[PDB]
Structure formats: C-alpha cells, structure tokens
Design a protein around this nucleic acid. Structure first.
Lengths: 315, 300
DNA sequence: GCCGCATAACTTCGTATAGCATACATTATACGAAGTTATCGCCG
DNA sequence: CGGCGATAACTTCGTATAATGTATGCTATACGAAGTTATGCGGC
C-alpha cells in the first residue's frame, strides 16, 4: 500500500489532478495489480509483458467484462505515459491477447445492458396513489418525480437546483434557469411544488436548495448547501419500485428496479412513440446526434410497411 | 512485372487474413507504388517520409481524390504494420501535409454525387411499354426490377436469393426471408409478374435452384443450381433500359449518367420522403443507421 | 430522568460497468474492358 | 456441309472513389455493504 501511496503522491507532486472518479479508479487498479503481482511473487512496480499477459488471462479466468480489462490496460498505458515509461505496453502480445479475448467474448453474444424504463402510466399511477398522502415526504417525492419526468435533467443537476434559480409566472407556470438554459414547469406541477415549498417552509433563502433533509420526526430542516444525497434519491426509486412491485429479484442482477435513468428513458421513448419532430427532441435534449436515441426507438412497434399497400393502392 | 510478383509474394509471406476486395486493392496499390518507385529508382520496400512526401506531391499533381491519396497512405501503414514495420509514416510531416492537402482539396468545393433516381412513375411507364412483351427474358428482367423496387436492397442480396427462400400465402401474397433476417412482402401486380416469369421459364424446379438463370440467344433459358453472379449483368439491364428511355450516354464519362444499383433504393426512399412519413420504421426497413447521407437523399 | 439502544436516514467505500468524439482502419461500389461459348448462319 | 464467322449472353479483370466501422483518452454510474449519527422510543 505505502508503495502505491508514495508513488501516487509523487505523481500528485506534478500537480496534475484527475477527475475524482479517475484518480480513485486509478489507485484501485494500482492496488489490484500490486496485490496479484505480489501473490505471484513478482516485482510489483516494474511490469513485464508476459507477466501482464498472465494477469490478463487470470482476469479472463475471473470472467470479467472485457471492457474492464481494456480499462485496466488503459490505466496501465496512462501510468506509463504520465510516468514517462513507454505509454504502449508491448502491442504484439498485448494486442494479440486483446484480439483473442475480444473475439472469444463477442462469440458469447453478450449485451451492453439497458436500464428499465419508467412509464408514463407508472407515473400517473404513483401520482394517483401519493396525491392522497398527507406525508410531506411523499409530497416532496411526488413533486420531485414530476419535476424529473418533465425536465429529464441529469440527476446531479436536479440535485444541484437552488431556489435562486426558480421563477414562476402566469397560470402558475414556473421557470428555472441553469448554466445557461431555462426550462418551464407546467401549471399543475408548479402548484404541486408550491404545496411542497409552502408546507415545508424549505429554502426561504433563495441560496437554499429546494429539497432538504427530513428527519424521521417528519420534520424538514433546510440546508444552505447541497445535501448531495443522490444515493438517497436512488433509494427513493428503489422504494417506489418496491411499492409498485415487491423487492428486487434474488438474481443479483442490475436493472432489477427503476433507476434515475429509467424516467429519462421512459419519457424519451414516450416522445418517440408520440413521434414529435426529431431535431426538436435533440435540441431539447441538448443532445448530439446519437444512435442511442435510435436504440430507444429500436424497441418500438412501428413497422407498418404501408408502401406495399400504397403500390397496390394509389391506382 | 515478375519482379513485382516476387516482391509482393515475399511480403505476402507472413500471411494474414484479408477480404478478397482488400487483397485486390492492396495489390493494386503495391503495383502503383512499385511502378512509381522504380521509375524514381528508389528502394521499393523501405519507406522514407520525404519519399512519401514526394509521392503525395506527385499524386496531387495528378489531381487524384484526397480520399484515395489518404487511402494509399493507409495501405502503406497497413503494409508496415503487417510486415512488422512501424505503422506511422513519420506523423508530424505526414500529418501536417495531410492536413494541408485536405484543406486544399476541400477548397475545391466538390460535391458528393448521387445516382440517378427511379420512380414509381418510371416503373408505370416502363411497365406500360413492356407489358406487351412476349420474351421470357424481358419478363425475367421486369420481374426482377419489380422485386427490386419492392425490396430495395444490395444487388448482392437480391443475387443471393434462392427459390428455397420464397413462399406465397393468402391473396397470393409472397414472402421472402433474407439475411441472417427479415421477411419481405411482394405487392400483387408484381407477384403476378414474377409468377408469369416463373411459370413461363420453368426455372429452378428444385428450390435449391435460383430464380434467375442464364438465357440464350436461342430464346432459351438454362436454370442454375448455383449463383451466377448476374449482378454486373443486372447493371447492364439498368443501363439497357436507360438507353431505351434515352439515347446513349454522354461522352463525359462521368458516373451517375444513368440508373445504378442505388437508383431503385434511393428512388423509393425519396418517394417515401416525399410521402413524408414513417421516418424511423422505414429507415429500419431499409436498414440504414441514421446518417446525413439519408438526409441528402431526403433533403430535396 | 437516566440508561439502554433501537430504526431510520445518511456517508463512505468498493468494483463492475456504461458513456462518447475522433482518427484512421476495413469493406464496397462504379465503371471500361478483355476474354468466353455454344449456338446458328450458310456456300454452292 | 459443316467449317469458320458471327452472335448473344455472360464472366474476370483493373482502374479510381465511398461507405462503413471502431477504439482510443477521459469522463461518470449501479448496486451491496459496513459504517455512521441521533434522537426518540422503551424500561423503571
């Protein structure tokens, strides 16, 4: 440990700093390698292409997702470059191994996984159910869900939202500007969020964040700083899935329940089935032209084939 | 030439997989390079970045398309790689020249050219013209075209099609499963057309056998249990019919002076775009991944 | 009115996995041409 | 009379140009889990 700690501090003395995810993951990798390499009683710091290859094949016996391994290799080349060692690990052995394990895993026919959608029908059902709720937590949560299903923001960005951002206007319509884009909230959900705001008294200071901690007492306490409890919001999605359905399946699989994506996905598919003009959608999404969108669209019934009819028809 | 044969067989040593197209084009690039390099009396096998520079300058003096010059560069990289030599031609000079000549070529403002469209209206016209025709080879060609405009594929895909592929159903509708795959449907009038072809020809009694097989100047057809690779001949059909609706080609020698294998697919695509409907599901049925090319079929 | 200590909400960590902009690597097309084939023409 | 001439109807080849694909350097995320706080629920 102290070896990697020291080496990473010596790198940090270059005063380059990664993303926190980046640096985290990097250190994790360094741990993993040094531990396996010591287990094989090989020098942990200086790599060897046959030792790296053996490691890689050990990982393949571990059954890891190829992408992971690839990521490992990337990390290693990164370390070389930024250490000033040969950025590429010796490509013949490395690339031949990569090609082998790539093709061998592709031959499994495995898929890049997709989060389950959250439907508009589910949203309407949970609205009908929770609208009866007197619990301010339930009011807040339904308001949050309505906001999400309108705006489809990044979860961290909806967590970022701060009362100085928010404005509302005729009909009770509400508008929120963020770095710089303003999005509009439709009248009924402006009234719902007003109910939340007024009942909680949360964030009377516009510095303060719209959603704030609520104790088991049922008491909100405002915060002048972000709670960042995105894991808690994910727990909300779990709870609501565990309300419309039971607990998660015992398979230990991912995507066994709704996730912060799932609403985004759902509304995207809803717009696709509505068939509204595509560039409109992409502009509203702030979105690069992306076949991801079409992988959404991919999962839809539209296969009418009318041209056979029109050929037979039209006469 | 035999020197080039020896040289390329030598480098072909350390054999590795290619498409036949890829190996053909590789060998053609090697021909061009070896001829040029011998003309320059330079070492044929080892590269030098100043030699690559001079070669590229010569290719620019020939005014070849920058895409093809780049492709040659690519091929050179390839041969280094697979022979075990350094992939990159020394990048800073190479890249700088690349960029500069790229800019200079884009400064020409040239267009991506597009094949001559074909319409339902054209189909109607040619059908009205040829429906009187007794020649079974004409019935063959027309049946072929009516399928193509129903299905709008690669020419290779339609070539593959085998009588075992084909079935027909209620209303006399006919369905064909193709690729790994998709089943497509044939509209009634062209069903009757293709049935006339099949019944008159007697072709492919075994469903192994292909729907279209050779004709003879005798006015005779010979069935084939094997793919005949008609496709170039099918292009000849497209050209012949173009030379029926019009005279000979212009002497400009340009591409897209007449209908091409694209022409039916692109045509029906624009037809649907003018119908203005079903964008994603029709793109699905044609199998395109979303691309600006689709837009420039649609754009007008 | 203090000790016990709970459920709950929340922080942090681990690791297995998913996004994506770009350069340049792999496959196909469009075309003019040479070369085939076997079948009929038909001399006198 | 049946040869070669000529053909239809076809195939293999060489040229130049595009369409198609992906992996690379950097980012963020899904789900379990231990651990944390805390104050309020329970007793006498």
């Amino acid at each position: 440990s102290d070896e990697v700690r020291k080496n990473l501090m010596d790198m940090f003395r270059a005063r380059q700093v990664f993303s926190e995810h980046t640096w985290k993951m990097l250190l994790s990798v360094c741990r993993s390698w040094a531990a396996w390499c010591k287990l094989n009683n090989r020098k942990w710091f200086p790599a060897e292409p046959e030792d790296v290859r053996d490691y890689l094949l050990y990982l393949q016996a571990r059954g890891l997702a190829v992408k992971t391994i690839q990521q490992h290799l990337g990390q290693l080349n990164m370390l070389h470059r930024r250490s000033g060692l040969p950025r590429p690990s010796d490509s013949n052995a490395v690339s031949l191994v990569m090609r082998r394990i790539r093709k061998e895993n592709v031959d499994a026919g495995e898929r890049a996984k997709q989060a389950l959608a959250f439907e508009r029908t589910d949203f309407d059902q949970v609205r009908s159910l929770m609208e009866n709720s007197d619990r301010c937590q339930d009011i807040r949560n339904l308001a949050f869900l309505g906001i999400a299903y309108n705006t489809l923001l990044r979860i961290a960005e909806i967590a970022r939202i701060r009362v100085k951002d928010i404005s509302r206007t005729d009909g009770g319509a509400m508008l929120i500007h963020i770095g710089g884009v303003e999005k509009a909230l439709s009248l009924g959900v402006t009234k719902l969020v007003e109910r939340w705001i007024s009942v909680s008294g949360v964030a009377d200071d516009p510095n303060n964040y719209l959603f704030c901690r609520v104790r088991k007492n049922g008491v909100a306490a405002p915060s002048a700083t972000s709670q960042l409890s995105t894991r808690a919001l994910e727990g909300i999605f779990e709870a609501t899935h565990r309300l419309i359905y039971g607990a998660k399946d015992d398979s230990g699989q991912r995507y066994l329940a709704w996730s912060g994506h799932s609403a985004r996905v759902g509304a995207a598919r809803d717009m696709a089935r509505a068939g509204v003009s595509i560039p409109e959608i992409m502009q509203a999404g702030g979105w690069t032209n992306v076949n991801i969108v079409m992988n959404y669209i991919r999962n839809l019934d539209s296969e009418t084939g009318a041209m056979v009819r029109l050929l037979e028809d039209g006469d």
